[PDB]
């Protein structure tokens, strides 16, 4: 599910699912 | 950055995992 274009809420959802209890950082400007 | 690499272009697990804590 990760190997595609992932934008906006779809990118954050992929980060959520992949990173699990680590959590993640979403920095779209930088 | 993540938008250029994963939204404007095709994402990958390698690149997404770099944003995990």
């Amino acid at each position: 599910f990760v190997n595609q274009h992932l934008c906006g809420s779809h990118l954050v959802e992929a980060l959520y699912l992949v990173c699990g209890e680590r959590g993640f950082f979403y920095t779209p400007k930088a | 950055g993540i938008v250029e690499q994963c939204c404007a272009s095709v994402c990958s697990l390698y690149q997404l995992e770099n944003y995990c804590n």
Side-chain angles (χ1 to χ4, degrees), chain A residues 14-25:
Chain A
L15 283 160
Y16 173 73
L17 288 173
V18 155
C19 296
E21 74 168 50
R22 299 179 269 178
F24 59 86
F25 58 99

PDB file of all heavy atoms in Angstrom, chain A residues 14-25:
ATOM      1  N   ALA A  14      -0.756   6.350   6.008  1.00  0.00           N
ATOM      2  CA  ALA A  14       0.322   5.344   5.701  1.00  0.00           C
ATOM      3  C   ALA A  14       1.388   5.422   6.773  1.00  0.00           C
ATOM      4  O   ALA A  14       1.860   4.353   7.274  1.00  0.00           O
ATOM      5  CB  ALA A  14       0.899   5.680   4.326  1.00  0.00           C
ATOM      6  N   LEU A  15       1.775   6.644   7.177  1.00  0.00           N
ATOM      7  CA  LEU A  15       2.788   6.818   8.294  1.00  0.00           C
ATOM      8  C   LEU A  15       2.291   6.199   9.559  1.00  0.00           C
ATOM      9  O   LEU A  15       3.023   5.478  10.256  1.00  0.00           O
ATOM     10  CB  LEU A  15       3.077   8.286   8.561  1.00  0.00           C
ATOM     11  CG  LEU A  15       4.023   8.955   7.531  1.00  0.00           C
ATOM     12  CD1 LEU A  15       3.880  10.498   7.562  1.00  0.00           C
ATOM     13  CD2 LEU A  15       5.485   8.549   7.725  1.00  0.00           C
ATOM     14  N   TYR A  16       0.999   6.446   9.861  1.00  0.00           N
ATOM     15  CA  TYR A  16       0.420   5.839  11.034  1.00  0.00           C
ATOM     16  C   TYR A  16       0.496   4.318  11.012  1.00  0.00           C
ATOM     17  O   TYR A  16       0.919   3.710  12.004  1.00  0.00           O
ATOM     18  CB  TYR A  16      -1.038   6.304  11.131  1.00  0.00           C
ATOM     19  CG  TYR A  16      -1.817   5.612  12.213  1.00  0.00           C
ATOM     20  CD1 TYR A  16      -1.599   5.902  13.578  1.00  0.00           C
ATOM     21  CD2 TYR A  16      -2.819   4.680  11.863  1.00  0.00           C
ATOM     22  CE1 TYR A  16      -2.337   5.195  14.617  1.00  0.00           C
ATOM     23  CE2 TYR A  16      -3.572   4.025  12.851  1.00  0.00           C
ATOM     24  CZ  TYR A  16      -3.343   4.292  14.218  1.00  0.00           C
ATOM     25  OH  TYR A  16      -4.148   3.624  15.110  1.00  0.00           O
ATOM     26  N   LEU A  17       0.170   3.720   9.872  1.00  0.00           N
ATOM     27  CA  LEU A  17       0.090   2.251   9.823  1.00  0.00           C
ATOM     28  C   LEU A  17       1.515   1.674   9.845  1.00  0.00           C
ATOM     29  O   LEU A  17       1.757   0.642  10.460  1.00  0.00           O
ATOM     30  CB  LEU A  17      -0.656   1.827   8.546  1.00  0.00           C
ATOM     31  CG  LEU A  17      -2.163   2.117   8.584  1.00  0.00           C
ATOM     32  CD1 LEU A  17      -2.781   1.797   7.166  1.00  0.00           C
ATOM     33  CD2 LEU A  17      -2.846   1.299   9.649  1.00  0.00           C
ATOM     34  N   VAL A  18       2.426   2.314   9.155  1.00  0.00           N
ATOM     35  CA  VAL A  18       3.812   1.746   9.000  1.00  0.00           C
ATOM     36  C   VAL A  18       4.599   1.938  10.284  1.00  0.00           C
ATOM     37  O   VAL A  18       5.304   1.000  10.688  1.00  0.00           O
ATOM     38  CB  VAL A  18       4.513   2.441   7.837  1.00  0.00           C
ATOM     39  CG1 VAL A  18       6.011   2.441   7.928  1.00  0.00           C
ATOM     40  CG2 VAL A  18       3.968   1.806   6.572  1.00  0.00           C
ATOM     41  N   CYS A  19       4.431   3.082  10.949  1.00  0.00           N
ATOM     42  CA  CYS A  19       5.317   3.415  12.068  1.00  0.00           C
ATOM     43  C   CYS A  19       4.837   2.791  13.389  1.00  0.00           C
ATOM     44  O   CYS A  19       5.669   2.612  14.273  1.00  0.00           O
ATOM     45  CB  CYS A  19       5.493   4.924  12.213  1.00  0.00           C
ATOM     46  SG  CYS A  19       6.299   5.705  10.802  1.00  0.00           S
ATOM     47  N   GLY A  20       3.532   2.492  13.500  1.00  0.00           N
ATOM     48  CA  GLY A  20       2.957   1.793  14.702  1.00  0.00           C
ATOM     49  C   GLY A  20       3.276   2.549  16.001  1.00  0.00           C
ATOM     50  O   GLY A  20       3.189   3.777  16.021  1.00  0.00           O
ATOM     51  N   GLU A  21       3.718   1.846  17.056  1.00  0.00           N
ATOM     52  CA  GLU A  21       3.886   2.511  18.355  1.00  0.00           C
ATOM     53  C   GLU A  21       5.077   3.502  18.440  1.00  0.00           C
ATOM     54  O   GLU A  21       5.161   4.287  19.344  1.00  0.00           O
ATOM     55  CB  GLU A  21       3.858   1.484  19.512  1.00  0.00           C
ATOM     56  CG  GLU A  21       5.130   0.666  19.587  1.00  0.00           C
ATOM     57  CD  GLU A  21       5.216  -0.126  20.903  1.00  0.00           C
ATOM     58  OE1 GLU A  21       4.207  -0.822  21.249  1.00  0.00           O
ATOM     59  OE2 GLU A  21       6.275   0.007  21.595  1.00  0.00           O
ATOM     60  N   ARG A  22       5.959   3.504  17.439  1.00  0.00           N
ATOM     61  CA  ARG A  22       6.982   4.542  17.314  1.00  0.00           C
ATOM     62  C   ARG A  22       6.355   5.922  17.162  1.00  0.00           C
ATOM     63  O   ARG A  22       6.906   6.969  17.625  1.00  0.00           O
ATOM     64  CB  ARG A  22       7.897   4.253  16.078  1.00  0.00           C
ATOM     65  CG  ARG A  22       8.630   2.917  16.198  1.00  0.00           C
ATOM     66  CD  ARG A  22       9.536   2.686  14.878  1.00  0.00           C
ATOM     67  NE  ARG A  22       8.805   1.943  13.828  1.00  0.00           N
ATOM     68  CZ  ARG A  22       9.324   1.651  12.618  1.00  0.00           C
ATOM     69  NH1 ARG A  22      10.560   2.077  12.280  1.00  0.00           N
ATOM     70  NH2 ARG A  22       8.594   0.957  11.724  1.00  0.00           N
ATOM     71  N   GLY A  23       5.213   5.975  16.491  1.00  0.00           N
ATOM     72  CA  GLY A  23       4.762   7.290  16.002  1.00  0.00           C
ATOM     73  C   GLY A  23       5.695   7.826  14.913  1.00  0.00           C
ATOM     74  O   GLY A  23       6.605   7.095  14.399  1.00  0.00           O
ATOM     75  N   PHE A  24       5.506   9.084  14.517  1.00  0.00           N
ATOM     76  CA  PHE A  24       6.181   9.591  13.368  1.00  0.00           C
ATOM     77  C   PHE A  24       6.138  11.092  13.365  1.00  0.00           C
ATOM     78  O   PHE A  24       5.433  11.708  14.189  1.00  0.00           O
ATOM     79  CB  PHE A  24       5.508   9.052  12.054  1.00  0.00           C
ATOM     80  CG  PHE A  24       4.018   9.423  11.920  1.00  0.00           C
ATOM     81  CD1 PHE A  24       3.642  10.674  11.360  1.00  0.00           C
ATOM     82  CD2 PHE A  24       3.026   8.573  12.441  1.00  0.00           C
ATOM     83  CE1 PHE A  24       2.256  11.021  11.273  1.00  0.00           C
ATOM     84  CE2 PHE A  24       1.670   8.928  12.364  1.00  0.00           C
ATOM     85  CZ  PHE A  24       1.287  10.128  11.764  1.00  0.00           C
ATOM     86  N   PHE A  25       6.881  11.694  12.469  1.00  0.00           N
ATOM     87  CA  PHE A  25       6.700  13.110  12.268  1.00  0.00           C
ATOM     88  C   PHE A  25       6.314  13.430  10.832  1.00  0.00           C
ATOM     89  O   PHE A  25       6.807  12.816   9.872  1.00  0.00           O
ATOM     90  CB  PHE A  25       7.919  13.912  12.792  1.00  0.00           C
ATOM     91  CG  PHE A  25       9.212  13.523  12.162  1.00  0.00           C
ATOM     92  CD1 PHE A  25       9.752  14.292  11.116  1.00  0.00           C
ATOM     93  CD2 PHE A  25       9.915  12.394  12.628  1.00  0.00           C
ATOM     94  CE1 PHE A  25      11.017  13.922  10.516  1.00  0.00           C
ATOM     95  CE2 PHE A  25      11.177  11.999  12.032  1.00  0.00           C
ATOM     96  CZ  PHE A  25      11.709  12.758  10.981  1.00  0.00           C
TER      97      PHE A  25
END
